[PDB]
């Protein structure tokens, strides 16, 4: 159920080469909170990749610590998928965490690397969050 302590979800960004604004994925619930993948271009140059948590809530008392693995799927060989691990205490003043320079933009969009196809790039996140605080008293 949504109370699950961990989960893995993906988000495929279309017309990736033309990305200009930051894109948001639908929500994935774990620990009963909405988690999303956030992608945006940073300086062409590099791919910004972040994990967002409970950002829609107007609450300022909640907090949830989690560890996750942020990965950019390589459709030609998952062994060549690039991923980085994170650990962070999520709360309103820091509802997202990740890397603004997660990968080189020219590399991810390289048709010969196997990360991009039909101008689509799939993002995956494996999050393992602890019980939250300041939410379900």
């Amino acid at each position: 159920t949504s109370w699950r302590s961990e989960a893995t979800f993906q988000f495929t960004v279309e017309r990736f080469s033309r990305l200009s604004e930051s894109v948001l994925s639908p929500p994935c619930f774990v620990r009963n909170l909405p988690w999303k993948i956030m992608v945006m271009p940073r300086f062409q140059k590099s791919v910004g990749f972040f994990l967002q948590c409970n950002a829609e809530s107007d609450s300022t008392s909640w907090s949830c610590h989690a560890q996750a693995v942020l990965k950019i799927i390589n459709y030609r060989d998952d062994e060549k998928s690039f991923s980085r691990r994170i650990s962070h205490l999520f709360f309103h003043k820091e509802n997202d965490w990740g890397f603004s320079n997660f990968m080189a933009w020219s590399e991810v969009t390289d048709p010969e690397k196997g990360f991009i196809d039909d101008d689509k790039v799939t993002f995956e996140v494996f999050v393992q969050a602890d019980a939250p605080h300041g939410v379900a008293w």
Binding site: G98, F99, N101
Partner: peptide, 7 residues
């Protein structure tokens, strides 16, 4: 690189 928030 080093991790942070999108902000």
């Amino acid at each position: 690189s080093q991790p942070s928030t999108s902000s």
